[PDB]
Design a protein around this ligand. Structure first.
Ligand code: BCL
Ligand code: BCL
Ligand SMILES: COC(C)(C)C/C=C/C(C)=C/C=C/C(C=O)=C/C=C/C(C)=C/C=C/C=C(C)/C=C/C=C(\C)CC/C=C(C)/C=C/C=C(\C)C(=O)O
Ligand SMILES: COC(C)(C)C/C=C/C(C)=C/C=C/C(C=O)=C/C=C/C(C)=C/C=C/C=C(C)/C=C/C=C(\C)CC/C=C(C)/C=C/C=C(\C)C(=O)O
Ligand SMILES: COC(C)(C)C/C=C/C(C)=C/C=C/C(C=O)=C/C=C/C(C)=C/C=C/C=C(C)/C=C/C=C(\C)CC/C=C(C)/C=C/C=C(\C)C(=O)O
Ligand SMILES: COC(C)(C)C/C=C/C(C)=C/C=C/C(C=O)=C/C=C/C(C)=C/C=C/C=C(C)/C=C/C=C(\C)CC/C=C(C)/C=C/C=C(\C)C(=O)O
Ligand SMILES: COC(C)(C)C/C=C/C(C)=C/C=C/C(C=O)=C/C=C/C(C)=C/C=C/C=C(C)/C=C/C=C(\C)CC/C=C(C)/C=C/C=C(\C)C(=O)O
Ligand SMILES: COC(C)(C)C/C=C/C(C)=C/C=C/C(C=O)=C/C=C/C(C)=C/C=C/C=C(C)/C=C/C=C(\C)CC/C=C(C)/C=C/C=C(\C)C(=O)O
Ligand SMILES: COC(C)(C)C/C=C/C(C)=C/C=C/C(C=O)=C/C=C/C(C)=C/C=C/C=C(C)/C=C/C=C(\C)CC/C=C(C)/C=C/C=C(\C)C(=O)O
Ligand SMILES: COC(C)(C)C/C=C/C(C)=C/C=C/C(C=O)=C/C=C/C(C)=C/C=C/C=C(C)/C=C/C=C(\C)CC/C=C(C)/C=C/C=C(\C)C(=O)O
Ligand SMILES: COC(C)(C)C/C=C/C(C)=C/C=C/C(C=O)=C/C=C/C(C)=C/C=C/C=C(C)/C=C/C=C(\C)CC/C=C(C)/C=C/C=C(\C)C(=O)O
Ligand SMILES: COC(C)(C)C/C=C/C(C)=C/C=C/C(C=O)=C/C=C/C(C)=C/C=C/C=C(C)/C=C/C=C(\C)CC\C=C(C)/C=C/C=C(/C)C(=O)O
Ligand SMILES: CCCCCCCCCCCCO[C@@H]1O[C@H](CO)[C@@H](O[C@H]2O[C@H](CO)[C@@H](O)[C@H](O)[C@H]2O)[C@H](O)[C@H]1O
Lengths: 38, 69, 50, 48, 56, 38, 57, 52, 56, 38, 48, 38, 48, 38, 48, 49, 39, 40, 41, 40, 40
């Protein structure tokens, strides 16, 4: 629970959350090209 | 074998006997409930008189009164 | 009835509960659930020319 | 410019780059198959 | 082979065996009695050619 | 128990089991005479 | 910004996040599967013009 | 091999045997309930005359 | 990213992952089996042009 | 249970398993003669 | 070649061999009855 | 359990698992000959 | 080449080999019966 | 649990995960050839 | 090149190799049966 | 350039590369069968006989 | 639980028994072939 | 363990002899079968 | 301290830029050949 | 850990020669099959 | 873990030559498949 290891964990966690949203955005792009919902 | 050092023969013997009993009973009952192998009623039929291909989910009537029996 | 004729699979219920038509199906109207109520029609490989 | 790589594992960078490139290449190869219609036309020629 | 009786109590084995054998015998007799061909209490006097046979 | 006690019990148990099987076999032979199932 | 983990256990936060995300993904996929327009197991080969559309006014 | 220092072989093998038995029973049951693979009644049919 | 194993016990993680993966695989296989298009036990010998398609 | 006891038990268990398992083979062959299922 | 029997008692071996030979003889006798047509033809003669 | 115990159990476990897969593969080959499912 | 047998039980090797050969012989005998049609034609000759 | 054991376990876990994903990719390609869902 | 074998059990390697070969040979034998039409044509000859 | 291999396990690398190559070979072989149509036409020849 | 000499003597007896079985089976197969050949 | 160096070598020799004999007799069986009903 | 200290971090940057460049050129040639085969504009 | 460097080298030699034997025998099989029913 | 600097160099050399051999063998396979049935 030290600030340096918390810096490392924040970097990893923010990067993971970031990549998850980008991959979901690509999934939504493909779904929209297949069958738009609006 | 070393399998008997990890597993005590006393317990695995009872588990094995129970499994074989339930499996044999299941198979004999399944055969008894089939048309082709209901041997107690049709065991005297030859192989050419035995029923074939009679799955038929509604092979019998579902609704009827009880028989006099 | 003196004799019994086996119906086609498409006219046969999968669910053998007696009161399923008045307790569930009368209040259920889902399309796929309605589809799974009966067996599907069948044929043979020779009849399909395969 | 190289100081950005400080404090990180080279293996994780290579692994993430490989995942990026593989996923992007699959998506773009499907996109390109649709645009060009290559396997369809050649296969129709061979499966006549 | 006799050494199995040092692994399993003969008393317990005999009691379990007797119970299983009695249950199996009763189940087989009842299955036969519920059948058409072998319901011997009612139709046991029929000859083997008069006894019911399942549909061919 | 000892080994010889198990020896004697095993002899008695084997004889009883085999006698039971033979008596059941004769019962099946009689039932076959009355009404064969095959 | 990274002080948030001093109030919440990261081990007990990632587990809850994963569980919620899995449940939400399953719920959305199942809602889509139970619909008519997006029952992709059956009609997924239809084009966007042939896909069902709900009743209008 | 060192996986067996992290997992008990006894528990792993008991779980594997149970799961595999249940899976085999489920598959055999699904096949028996089907029309094409109801082998107790259909088994003597050739592949061409089997239901589709 | 090996340090994840210092925050989470590998044993419990692998057990939970195996259970979740097995349940998910079973659910997908049975969703496919119950559909008209992907029964594969009754209609698996049909070609892609003869397989059922949902209504337009 | 020692190693020699496991060896001695394994011998009998294997022979009993073999005898049972393919006395079942004789049963299956008899049933196939009577009414084949394939 | 005889050292293959070292450490195994002969009684178990003979019981297993007897089980094997009994099962094989029974199965092959049923097989031969089906192939040769015996005793079906002789039984047909005597039960005429 | 020691490391050599783990190695020795691994040998039997791997061989048994792989052999079981091979036997299942042969069973599937026979079933495909009798009635193909594709 | 013989050092592959180091550390192994000869009885286990022979039992595994016997299981292999028995299963393979059964499978290939069924295969060959289907291919040649031998018992079928001889049974038809004798049972008719 | 040292960092050495964590790293050694992580290598095996990543290799197994990749094997699983690749076999699933082969399965999905086979299924797509047999009966496409889009 | 031999340094890859260091630390591995030769029996585990032989089991994995046998598994690979058996599975691949079964797959390719079915493939070749489907391609060549053997033994279907010979079976049809002998079972007219 | 070789230092990327430093700190890894050669057996793990070979196993992962083998998994990758085997899966890729299987996928591209099915892809090529579909494109060329080879087994289909040869089976047609040997089954029309 | 067998020893070296015990294994040697048992193996000799086993070989003799196998040979006797084989010879008797060969005679039986010859008689059966003369009666009803199966090829 | 078991099957030490001398034992392993003698076992290897007898194993090779058995495999050779088995292959030979199987080859004669296949030769007879080919004469009776060729499968190609 | 940790991974890729300054010297091998510079060396890693060198190899990484070399690899990125080589990848870019081979992809450029691939796009060139694709454009002469079937132009997409 | 088994298979130290010396026996790893020995095992490598035996593995390579076995692989060559298998490959050459498979090549003979493929030549015969090609003479019987060539593919493509 | 393992793979010290020297064995890293040796394994990199062996990996590179294996990769090149695989590359050339695949190139020959594609060359033959192109004359058999070109895909463009
Ligand atoms: C009509 C509906 C559409 C469709 C529309 C969508 C859309 C739109 C989306 C999905 C998404 C997903 N779909 Mg869906 N989907 C369809 C049909 C399917 C079928 C099927 C049997 O047909 C399956 C199995 C799936 C499965 C999935 C999952 C892969 C994914 C949800 C992930 C999740 O829960 O993470 C739970 C939690 C996790 C932590 C796992 C995260 C895993 C992801 C894939 C990657 C993480 C990257 C991260 C940076 C880590 C990197 C590590 C480094 C490389 C080392 N879909 C049909 C055709 N699906 C969602 C998604 O996330 O896509 C990417 C999404 O947005
Ligand atoms: C149409 C195709 C051709 C043909 C073309 C080729 C070509 C070309 C090649 C072979 C090869 C081989 N073929 Mg082929 N082959 C044909 C038909 C056969 C038949 C047969 C009776 O029909 C047999 C027995 C064989 C046998 C063989 C092997 C000797 C060899 C592969 C080695 C191997 O198995 O590695 C795998 C190792 C194993 C041990 C396999 C084990 C598989 C068995 C089935 C497992 C049984 C397990 C267990 C006992 C099962 C019990 C099941 C019960 C239900 C309980 N072929 C037909 C005529 N064959 C290859 C070779 O090396 O040739 C020299 C090769 O290149
Ligand atoms: C039908 O329509 C309905 C459905 C009804 C409408 C919907 C409505 C609703 C309510 C939608 C809600 C959406 C939503 C928000 O609420 C959605 C929220 C989404 C969010 C936030 C996603 C975030 C994901 C984050 C991830 C995956 C992070 C991963 C991190 C990783 C991998 C790093 C781990 C690495 C470590 C730990 C190593 C260091 C270890 C260290 C240092 C060590 O251990 O030492
Ligand atoms: C359609 O029908 C369905 C049902 C569906 C079809 C299915 C059928 C199925 C699955 C059937 C299963 C059958 C089965 C299972 O295997 C059957 C197995 C049967 C067996 C093993 C029977 C064994 C009987 C043994 C007996 C009787 C032994 C007696 C021994 C005695 C009396 C001696 C004891 C007395 C002593 C010792 C005194 C001395 C004391 C001493 C020395 C002292 O005290 O010291
Ligand atoms: C309709 O189709 C559906 C059903 C739906 C499809 C289903 C299909 C399925 C799932 C089938 C499953 C099959 C299966 C596997 O799961 C089958 C598995 C079968 C097996 C392995 C059977 C093994 C039996 C072993 C036996 C009998 C052993 C007996 C041993 C004896 C007698 C010796 C004991 C005495 C001793 C030792 C005394 C010495 C003691 C000493 C010296 C001492 O103590 O010291
Ligand atoms: C309609 O179809 C639906 C159902 C819808 C579709 C289905 C879809 C699904 C999801 C299918 C799932 C499949 C699946 C899941 O992953 C399949 C997974 C299968 C697996 C992993 C099988 C593994 C089997 C392993 C076995 C048998 C191991 C045997 C080990 C042995 C014999 C060694 C014995 C040990 C010894 C001797 C030790 C001695 C002691 C020693 C040495 C000591 O004490 O030291
Ligand atoms: C109808 O459509 C619906 C279904 C509704 C839509 C679906 C929607 C959803 C939500 C889908 C979900 C997808 C998903 C993501 O969330 C799926 C997630 C998939 C994932 C991550 C799979 C990962 C698998 C990894 C595996 C198998 C790894 C195994 C590891 C192995 C073999 C190595 C072990 C070896 C050891 C341990 C030995 C060394 C030990 C050592 C050194 C030691 O012990 O020291
Ligand atoms: C029909 O369709 C399908 C079924 C598909 C067709 C296919 C069928 C197939 C593939 C069949 C295979 C058959 C086969 C081969 O594989 C069959 C193999 C058979 C064999 C090996 C038989 C061997 C018999 C050996 C015997 C009888 C030996 C007896 C020895 C005796 C009497 C001596 C005992 C006394 C001793 C020792 C003295 C003790 C001294 C002591 C104690 C001391 O002195 O210490
Ligand atoms: C139908 O369609 C599909 C299925 C597709 C078609 C099929 C296709 C395929 C792929 C088939 C594959 C076939 C195959 C694969 O290679 C077949 C492989 C077969 C093999 C390897 C056979 C080998 C047999 C070996 C034998 C018999 C050796 C016995 C040796 C003995 C007896 C010696 C005993 C030694 C002693 C006693 C010394 C003790 C000393 C001691 C103890 C001391 O010294 O201490
Ligand atoms: C069609 O899609 C829709 C959506 C429809 C349209 C949209 C499309 C869009 C938006 C696309 C976006 C694309 C894009 C984004 O910018 C694309 C960006 C691509 C990029 C940048 C790729 C970079 C590749 C880099 C590579 C290959 C580097 C390799 C390096 C190597 C091999 C060297 C490694 C070895 C070393 C270092 C030695 C170790 C030494 C050590 C350790 C030591 O010395 O110590
Ligand atoms: C079809 O539709 C879609 C799919 C959409 C189309 C798209 C397709 C796409 C995009 C495909 C991409 C393909 C691709 C790239 O990504 C493909 C890339 C492939 C690659 C990189 C292959 C590399 C292979 C390397 C090999 C074989 C090396 C082997 C080395 C060996 C054997 C020796 C090892 C040394 C040892 C063991 C001993 C060393 C010393 C030691 C240890 C010591 O001394 O100690
Ligand atoms: C449907 O169509 C699709 C499927 C799509 C089309 C197919 C496509 C594809 C891509 C197929 C792929 C094929 C392939 C991939 O490369 C095939 C690869 C095949 C390979 C590599 C075969 C290699 C075999 C090697 C063997 C047999 C070696 C044996 C070694 C021996 C015997 C020596 C050891 C002996 C001893 C005694 C040990 C001493 C031990 C010790 C300790 C000592 O002595 O000290
Ligand atoms: C030991 C393992 C197994 C090895 C053997 C496996 C293969 C079996 C070989 C079968 C050999 C029998 O060989 C076969 O004998 C029969 C005897 O009727 C001969 O048959 C001949 O006589 C019969 C009856 O008189 C005629 O109907 C027939 O047309 C004529 O050819 C066959 O021409 C010959 O090919």
């Amino acid at each position: 629970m030290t600030e340096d290891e918390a810096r490392r964990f924040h970097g990893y966690f923010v990067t993971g959350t970031l990549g998850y949203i980008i991959v979901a955005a690509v999934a939504h792009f493909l779904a929209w090209q297949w069958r738009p919902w609006f | 074998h070393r399998i008997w050092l990890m597993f005590d023969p006393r317990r695995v013997m009872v588990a094995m006997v129970g499994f074989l009993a339930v499996l044999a009973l299941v198979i004999h009952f399944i055969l008894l409930s089939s048309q082709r192998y209901s041997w107690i009623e049709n065991g005297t039929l030859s192989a050419a008189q035995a029923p074939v291909g009679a799955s038929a989910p509604a092979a019998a009537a579902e609704m009827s009164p009880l028989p006099p029996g | 009835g003196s004799s019994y004729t086996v119906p086609a699979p498409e006219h046969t219920r999968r669910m053998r509960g007696i009161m399923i038509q008045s307790t569930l199906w009368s209040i259920d109207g889902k399309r796929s659930a309605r589809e799974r109520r009966h067996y599907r029609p069948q044929t043979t490989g020779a009849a399909l020319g395969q | 410019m190289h100081r950005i790589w400080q404090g990180m594992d080279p293996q994780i960078i290579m692994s993430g780059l490989g995942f990026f490139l593989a996923g992007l290449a699959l998506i773009i190869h499907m996109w390109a198959y649709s645009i060009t219609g290559w396997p369809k036309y050649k296969k129709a020629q061979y499966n006549a």
